[PDB]
Amino acid sequence: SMTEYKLVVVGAGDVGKSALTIQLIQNHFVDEYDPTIEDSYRKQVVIDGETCLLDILDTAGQEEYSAMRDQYMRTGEGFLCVFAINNTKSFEDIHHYREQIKRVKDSEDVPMVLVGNKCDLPSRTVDTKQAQDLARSYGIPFIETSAKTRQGVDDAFYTLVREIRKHKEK
Amino acid sequence: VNPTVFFDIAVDGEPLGRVSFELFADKVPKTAENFRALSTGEKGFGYKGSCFHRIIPGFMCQGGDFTRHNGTGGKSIYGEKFEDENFILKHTGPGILSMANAGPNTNGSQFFICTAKTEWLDGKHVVFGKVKEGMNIVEAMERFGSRNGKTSKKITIADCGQL
Numbered sequence: 001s002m003t004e005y006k007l008v009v010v011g012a013g014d015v016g017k018s019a020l021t022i023q024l025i026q027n028h029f030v031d032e033y034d035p036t037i038e039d040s041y042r043k044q045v046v047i048d049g050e051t052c053l054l055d056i057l058d059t060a061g062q063e064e065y066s067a068m069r070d071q072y073m074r075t076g077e078g079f080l081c082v083f084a085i086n087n088t089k090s091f092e093d094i095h096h097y098r099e100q101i102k103r104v105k106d107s108e109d110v111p112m113v114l115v116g117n118k119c120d121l122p123s124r125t126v127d128t129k130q131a132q133d134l135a136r137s138y139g140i141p142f143i144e145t146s147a148k149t150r151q152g153v154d155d156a157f158y159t160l161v162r163e164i165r166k167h168k169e170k
Numbered sequence: 171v172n173p174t175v176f177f178d179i180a181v182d183g184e185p186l187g188r189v190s191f192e193l194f195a196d197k198v199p200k201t202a203e204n205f206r207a208l209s210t211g212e213k214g215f216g217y218k219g220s221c222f223h224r225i226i227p228g229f230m231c232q233g234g235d236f237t238r239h240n241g242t243g244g245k246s247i248y249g250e251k252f253e254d255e256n257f258i259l260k261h262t263g264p265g266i267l268s269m270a271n272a273g274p275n276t277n278g279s280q281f282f283i284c285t286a287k288t289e290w291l292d293g294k295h296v297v298f299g300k301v302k303e304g305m306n307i308v309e310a311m312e313r314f315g316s317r318n319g320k321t322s323k324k325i326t327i328a329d330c331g332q333l
């Protein structure tokens with residue numbers, strides 16, 4: 001049957017992890033504050049001609065539980081590392097998420113995608129080059145998204161799948 | 171003397187039982203008063219008819235969103251939100267009543283009842299009361315929760331007021 005991909009969405013609180021996932025799954029956006037405990041979703045898609053099943057884990061950004069992440073990081077196959085382009089602290093928080101993933105999986109070769117969300121917003125404090133440089137230093141793709149306009153939403157999840165594919169044939 | 175309020179809890183419209191709370195007006199008068207007034211509905215709005223949207227066995231039952239009924243709303247009698255009054259009281263064990271929030275100084279109407287000791291919340295959530303009677307009602311609500319807090323039946327405050 002079709003290949004399943006275990007995707008995990010991580011990042012600081014309020015960056016839009018849930019809005020991105022609910023846009024992908026349900027194709028709508030609401031501007032309400034609904035902080036996540038933990039949610040899981042399934043969706044079948046076609047990527048580069050190949051049908052596959054996305055198993056998406058939407059994790060808590062709630063910073064006090066940073067010691068609770070090891071198990072979902074061991075289980076996950078690929079990580080959508082999300083920050084918001086109007087919040088510089090969320091961009092700085094990205095490094096700690098990547099270091100934690102690499103440490104927990106004891107590997108330099110973990111499929112990840114850096115996602116700069118909320119690009120519909122005028123108050124940008126993280127430049128495109130700033131994030132592109134970081135993604136280049138990580139060796140991973142960078143994609144800008146808006147959960148509100150749906151810009152780049154499919155592209156981010158699909159690219160992460162492409163990154164997992166390039167790893168499982170390695 | 172500290173005021174007492176009650177919740178009459180229903181499960182899919184069927185009565186379960188009454189929980190009453192002591193409100194620590196002597197330590198946190200402004201937060202206790204917010205909860206008291208919302209339990210009487212005296213400002214034209216409050217807890218009556220709202221649900222417990224998040225129940226996590228082993229930890230807590232959370233409710234109080236009477237404006238959107240889905241965990242994203244609520245409001246205080248002082249405006250949308252009000253400040254953290256103090257953190258004198260701790261989350262010592264089952265039955266503690268404490269304010270939910272979205273960070274410092276964001277108290278609205280949402281609240282939680284502890285079903286265990288949750289000491290990592292000390293100094294972040296304002297404790298302002300405790301279950302007086304009917305803790306077994308709260309224990310009974312737990313089985314309608316889950317690991318992420320989604321409930322399998324609608325757990326509602328069918329009636330509430332001051333005693």
Ligand SMILES: CCn1c(-c2cc(N3CCN(C)CC3)cnc2[C@H](C)OC)c2c3cc(ccc31)-c1csc(n1)C[C@H](NC(=O)[C@H]1C[C@@H]1C)C(=O)N1CCC[C@H](N1)C(=O)OCC(C)(C)C2
Pocket residue numbers: 033035036037038060062065068224226229230232241242269270271272278280281282288290291295317318
């Ligand atoms: C890591 C997984 N996780 C966990 C967690 C933590 C542990 N341990 C920590 C302590 N060690 C010693 C033992 C292990 C074990 N198991 C889990 C859960 C069961 O694993 C799935 C929690 C949690 C909370 C949030 C996000 C993820 C989270 C979160 C996300 S928004 C939040 N908190 C605060 C929340 N704001 C709101 O609702 C805003 C909307 C209103 C206005 C809020 O005011 N209140 C009231 C206080 C309780 C809190 N809700 C809540 O729901 O706490 C859940 C709880 C289980 C107690 C903690």
Ligand SMILES: Nc1nc2c(ncn2[C@@H]2O[C@H](COP(=O)(O)OP(=O)(O)NP(=O)(O)O)[C@@H](O)[C@H]2O)c(=O)[nH]1
Pocket residue numbers: 011012013014015016017018019020030031032033034035036037059060061062117118119120121145146147148149
């Ligand atoms: N303008 C705009 N707002 C967005 C975008 N993505 C999310 N938001 C808004 O930002 C807030 C936080 O979004 P949410 O997806 O809940 O963030 P989260 O990363 O899941 N937070 P948590 O880790 O607590 O679960 C909400 O008000 C949401 O509507 C976006 O692309 N554009």
Ligand SMILES: [Mg+2]
Pocket residue numbers: 017018019034035036058059060061
């Ligand atoms: Mg979320």
